[PDB]
Amino acid sequence: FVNQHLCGSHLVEALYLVCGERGFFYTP
């Protein structure tokens, strides 16, 4: 994940890895 473009679901993977069970948002 480090020093990578995060396109599509890759961003969702990254947000889960950072926010865990707190949830996260990325749209709209």
């Epitope: 994940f1 480090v2 990578q4 473009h5 995060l6 396109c7 599509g8 679901s9 890759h10 969702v12 993977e13 889960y16 890895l17 990325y26 749209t27």
Partner: antibody, heavy 120, light 107 residues
Amino acid sequence: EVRLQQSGPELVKPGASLKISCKASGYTFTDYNIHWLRQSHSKSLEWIGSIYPYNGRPGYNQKFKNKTTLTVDNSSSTAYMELRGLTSDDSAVYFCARSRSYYNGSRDYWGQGTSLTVSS
Amino acid sequence: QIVLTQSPAIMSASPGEKVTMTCSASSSVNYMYWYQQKPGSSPRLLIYDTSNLASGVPVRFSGSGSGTSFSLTISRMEAEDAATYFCQQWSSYPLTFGAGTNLELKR
């Protein structure tokens, strides 16, 4: 060539524990999540969880959290899933997998699966 | 939590026919995956992020959809496409799959 190699078929008794391994090669192990999935039959796929091999930080499906523990051994490029309190309901094939490569990947990678039979 | 419902659970086609399989989500999904699986084989990725063609899969396949309704299409069925097809949302966690759509051959 990316490959994920899983441990062999397993048969255990109810209540026992089991650690299934997933061996990775062909890429920087530390850069990608390893995902774990269970296939109870030909019409069911479930995501168990994911682990970040850089530091071992895992994310669990709450349904499997109580009885599943994910670890990693970066020096051996291997991921492990531990199952506890096993019952016949846990009989299934278990898959590890890795997402498509970042930026412009078009191919993900799956292990061959490990068959688990929970019976006395 | 996001429940995916694939219909028809069972459908038949002969080579040359157009096949459309649907995946209905219980809530908004931003990225939908699609996998193919035959007995004795690992799930094979076909579509990533809703409409992108996975590597090594033929151009007769196509993914589409938005919000709560998604589709996988085979412009012209070939016999070797007999298999079960799964949708998987990669929008919110936990990741969930549909129960699959069995595509069998007509006779």
